[PDB]
């Protein structure tokens, strides 16, 4: 089973990338299973503002690595980020500011949860889906 770990926000980079102090070392995390528009694509600065706002306002940030590979080729940590118990990954998708990404190297624990949310956002024609 997965487990959450504390992290401290250092700097939010964009819709799907955040910089945190993980285990005393600063590190960039790439949010698992989400594809936000590049900051400029339509809805890119909105997804960035959202991610940024969600993490800067949180009293507690926690990271959760999946069962697959924990870093990508650029050295970015691959995880689910929690801001005061709320998973940022899911929050983005539910708000229609991100598409569910293809599973990477066995990291699929929350793909169903995210798929559901995305369906709902499509249904409500939210942002990316309007």
HEC string for the chain: CCCCEEEEEEEEEECCEEEEEECCEEEEEEECCEECCCCCCCCHHHHHHHHHHHHHCCCCEEEEECCCCCECCCCCEEEEEEECCEEHHHHHHHCCCCEECCCECCECCCHHHHHHHHHHHHHCCCHHHC
* Alpha carbon 89 to its chain's center: 3
To what resolution in angstroms was this structure determined? 1.7
Q: Which CATH architecture has domain 1-130?
A: Beta Barrel (2.40)
Known binding-site residues equal 16, 35-36
Distance CA 85, CA 72 (A): 25
Q: Exactly one of 30, 46, 90, 94 is catalytic; which is it?
A: 30
Residues whose CB falls within 8 Å of the CB of residue 10, separated by 6 or more in sequence, listed in order: 19, 20, 21, 26
- Cα–Cα distances in Å, from 34 out to 3, 23, 25, 26, 61? 20, 24, 25, 22, 18
Distance CA 113, CA 89 (A): 10
Nearest to 95 by CA among 39, 40, 54, 65: 54
Nearest to 118 by CA among 60, 35, 42: 35
Known catalytic residue: 38?
A: yes
Radius of gyration of the chain (CA): 14
Known binding-site residues for Ca(2+) equal 16, 35-36
Q: Exactly one of 46, 62, 64, 76 is catalytic; which is it?
A: 76
């Amino acid at each position: 089973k997965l487990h959450k770990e504390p992290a401290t926000l250092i700097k939010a980079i964009d819709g799907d990338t955040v910089k945190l102090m993980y285990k005393g070392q600063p590190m960039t995390f790439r949010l698992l299973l989400v594809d936000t528009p590049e900051t400029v694509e339509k809805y890119g600065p909105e997804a960035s503002a959202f991610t940024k706002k969600m993490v800067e306002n949180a009293k507690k940030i926690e990271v959760e690595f999946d069962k697959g590979q924990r870093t990508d080729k650029y050295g970015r940590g691959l995880a689910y980020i929690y801001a005061d118990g709320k998973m940022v990954n899911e929050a983005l998708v539910r708000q229609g500011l991100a598409k569910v990404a293809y599973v990477y190297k066995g990291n699929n624990t929350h793909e169903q949860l995210l798929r559901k949310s995305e369906a709902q956002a499509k249904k409500e024609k939210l942002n990316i889906w309007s």
